[PDB]
Design an enzyme around this catalytic site. Structure first.
Site, PDB file in Angstrom:
ATOM      1  N   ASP A  64       0.778  -1.240   0.000  1.00  0.00           N
ATOM      2  CA  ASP A  64       0.000   0.000   0.000  1.00  0.00           C
ATOM      3  C   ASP A  64       0.810   1.291   0.000  1.00  0.00           C
ATOM      4  O   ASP A  64       2.046   1.259  -0.066  1.00  0.00           O
ATOM      5  CB  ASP A  64      -1.183   0.043   0.986  1.00  0.00           C
ATOM      6  CG  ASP A  64      -0.963  -0.782   2.217  1.00  0.00           C
ATOM      7  OD1 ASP A  64      -0.319  -0.258   3.145  1.00  0.00           O
ATOM      8  OD2 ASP A  64      -1.455  -1.937   2.263  1.00  0.00           O
ATOM      9  N   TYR A  66       2.419   4.843   1.092  1.00  0.00           N
ATOM     10  CA  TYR A  66       2.785   5.505   2.318  1.00  0.00           C
ATOM     11  C   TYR A  66       1.640   6.375   2.808  1.00  0.00           C
ATOM     12  O   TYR A  66       0.994   7.046   2.022  1.00  0.00           O
ATOM     13  CB  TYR A  66       4.060   6.306   2.065  1.00  0.00           C
ATOM     14  CG  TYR A  66       5.205   5.349   1.812  1.00  0.00           C
ATOM     15  CD1 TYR A  66       5.727   4.578   2.855  1.00  0.00           C
ATOM     16  CD2 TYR A  66       5.644   5.096   0.526  1.00  0.00           C
ATOM     17  CE1 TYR A  66       6.688   3.650   2.633  1.00  0.00           C
ATOM     18  CE2 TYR A  66       6.653   4.186   0.298  1.00  0.00           C
ATOM     19  CZ  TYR A  66       7.154   3.451   1.356  1.00  0.00           C
ATOM     20  OH  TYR A  66       8.112   2.491   1.138  1.00  0.00           O
ATOM     21  N   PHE A  77       7.153   2.260  -3.486  1.00  0.00           N
ATOM     22  CA  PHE A  77       8.482   2.597  -2.957  1.00  0.00           C
ATOM     23  C   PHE A  77       8.958   4.047  -3.140  1.00  0.00           C
ATOM     24  O   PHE A  77      10.081   4.355  -2.770  1.00  0.00           O
ATOM     25  CB  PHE A  77       9.546   1.655  -3.534  1.00  0.00           C
ATOM     26  CG  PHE A  77       9.363   0.215  -3.153  1.00  0.00           C
ATOM     27  CD1 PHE A  77       9.625  -0.204  -1.859  1.00  0.00           C
ATOM     28  CD2 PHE A  77       8.983  -0.732  -4.099  1.00  0.00           C
ATOM     29  CE1 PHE A  77       9.387  -1.512  -1.472  1.00  0.00           C
ATOM     30  CE2 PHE A  77       8.785  -2.073  -3.732  1.00  0.00           C
ATOM     31  CZ  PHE A  77       9.001  -2.479  -2.429  1.00  0.00           C
ATOM     32  N   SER A  88      12.906   0.839   3.222  1.00  0.00           N
ATOM     33  CA  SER A  88      12.960  -0.067   2.064  1.00  0.00           C
ATOM     34  C   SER A  88      13.753   0.537   0.929  1.00  0.00           C
ATOM     35  O   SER A  88      14.542  -0.149   0.275  1.00  0.00           O
ATOM     36  CB  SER A  88      11.555  -0.298   1.516  1.00  0.00           C
ATOM     37  OG  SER A  88      10.883  -1.283   2.276  1.00  0.00           O
ATOM     38  N   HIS A 187      11.857  -9.276   0.885  1.00  0.00           N
ATOM     39  CA  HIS A 187      11.456  -7.867   0.847  1.00  0.00           C
ATOM     40  C   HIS A 187      12.622  -6.976   1.302  1.00  0.00           C
ATOM     41  O   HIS A 187      13.268  -7.327   2.267  1.00  0.00           O
ATOM     42  CB  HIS A 187      10.252  -7.633   1.769  1.00  0.00           C
ATOM     43  CG  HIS A 187       9.608  -6.295   1.577  1.00  0.00           C
ATOM     44  ND1 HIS A 187      10.074  -5.152   2.192  1.00  0.00           N
ATOM     45  CD2 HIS A 187       8.620  -5.899   0.735  1.00  0.00           C
ATOM     46  CE1 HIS A 187       9.371  -4.112   1.769  1.00  0.00           C
ATOM     47  NE2 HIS A 187       8.503  -4.535   0.866  1.00  0.00           N
ATOM     48  N   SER A 192      13.573  -7.673   6.781  1.00  0.00           N
ATOM     49  CA  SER A 192      13.749  -8.922   6.049  1.00  0.00           C
ATOM     50  C   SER A 192      14.877  -8.869   5.014  1.00  0.00           C
ATOM     51  O   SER A 192      15.178  -9.887   4.377  1.00  0.00           O
ATOM     52  CB  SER A 192      12.427  -9.289   5.377  1.00  0.00           C
ATOM     53  OG  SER A 192      12.072  -8.253   4.491  1.00  0.00           O
TER      54      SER A 192
END
Ligand SMILES: [Mg+2]
Ligand SMILES: [Mg+2]
Lengths: 224, 109
Positions: A64, A66, A77, A88, A187, A192
């Site tokens: 989704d 931000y 992103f 990320s 991810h 992760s």
């Protein structure tokens, strides 16, 4: 459909009339009466405006948008300047700067320069309530962006899909691996990222696979 | 005072950060297996469960490589913590969907 690129409108307008979509729209309309919703309306579909649907060469499936002020603008992103890049995206920049010769952190998180080149930055859910992560989950967007993925699967050849995380992986689990390149890994979230993302070399692999496929590579630096 | 805000206060104290710097949030769904130390992920417990994750960042968090986070299962609080300069997860709270395994929430005042 307002603020929705015409080349995309052309091929995807079959959805606007399905009952789930009409409901989705009514929901988001009602949502915008009670809440600030991001992205503002003109930016919900930025991904249909940075390039023609036929110029799409690379696809990156996101989650989704931000959910704070001046962050989301229609590309997964990606944040608007001067808002700092998210964690990320900092990791994507890290992998790049090892993966891609002379990649420098561009000091911002606007990924518009990738979009213009035919990198499709497609979130699975296209709106959100301000300050409430996931608040528009499961209200129709997933089927709409599933359709975008299917249209692409069925109407193109040799795309490179970048599938980061199990979520994006399930979303892409029906791409024909005979006609399309699918590269998968953890991810890039700090949570992760050490489980595959660092050292995946996806940006150079994409470029090799694009060159191989008779298409022009992505200038990953054409942010700066 | 929200949990979020309490964790910010603790983190700004612990790490000498700016009290009023704006924090933003990143929110990512992922299976717990891909996110939690081995010793905390077990079948019939967290393993193979999708978590909702919140990771906080600002300029000075970036600069220090500190990433505070809060984890949820559905709407059940699963973890409060931070990742550090070395990538060690440290927890002020962790619950395995059965019971608390770690509870140091009192540090948040
Ligand atoms: Mg989400
Ligand atoms: Mg630790």
């Amino acid at each position: 459909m307002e603020f929705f690129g015409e080349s995309w409108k052309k091929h995807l307008s079959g959805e606007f009339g399905k009952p789930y979509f009409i409901k989705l729209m009514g929901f988001v309309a009602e949502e915008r009466k009670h809440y600030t919703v991001y992205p503002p309306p003109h930016q919900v579909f930025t991904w249909t405006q940075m390039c023609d649907i036929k110029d799409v060469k690379v696809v990156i499936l996101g989650q989704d948008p931000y959910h704070g002020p001046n962050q989301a603008h229609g590309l997964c992103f990606s944040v608007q300047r001067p808002v700092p890049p998210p964690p990320s995206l900092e990791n994507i920049y890290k992998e790049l700067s090892t993966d891609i010769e002379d990649f420098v952190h561009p000091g911002h998180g606007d990924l518009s320069g990738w979009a213009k080149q035919g990198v499709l930055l497609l979130n699975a859910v296209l709106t959100v309530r301000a300050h409430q992560a996931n608040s528009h989950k499961e209200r129709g967007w997933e089927q709409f962006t599933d359709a975008v993925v299917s249209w692409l699967n069925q109407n193109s050849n040799g795309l490179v899909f970048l599938l980061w995380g199990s979520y994006a992986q399930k979303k892409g689990s029906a791409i024909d691996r005979k006609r399309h390149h699918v590269l998968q890994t953890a991810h890039p979230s700090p949570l992760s990222v050490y489980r595959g993302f660092f050292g995946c070399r996806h940006f150079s692999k994409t470029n090799e696979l694009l060159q191989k496929s008779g298409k022009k590579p992505i200038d990953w630096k054409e942010l700066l | 005072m929200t949990l979020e805000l309490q964790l910010k206060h603790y983190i700004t104290n612990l790490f000498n950060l700016p009290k009023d710097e704006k924090w933003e949030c990143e929110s990512i769904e992922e299976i717990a297996d891909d996110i939690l130390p081995d010793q905390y992920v077990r079948l019939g417990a967290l393993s193979n469960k999708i978590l909702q994750t919140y990771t906080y960042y600002s300029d000075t968090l970036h600069e220090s490589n500190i990433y505070p986070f809060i984890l949820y299962y559905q709407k059940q609080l699963i973890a409060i913590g931070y990742i550090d300069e070395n990538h060690d997860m440290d927890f002020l709270y962790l619950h395995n969907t059965i019971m608390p395994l770690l509870d140091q929430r009192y540090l948040l005042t």
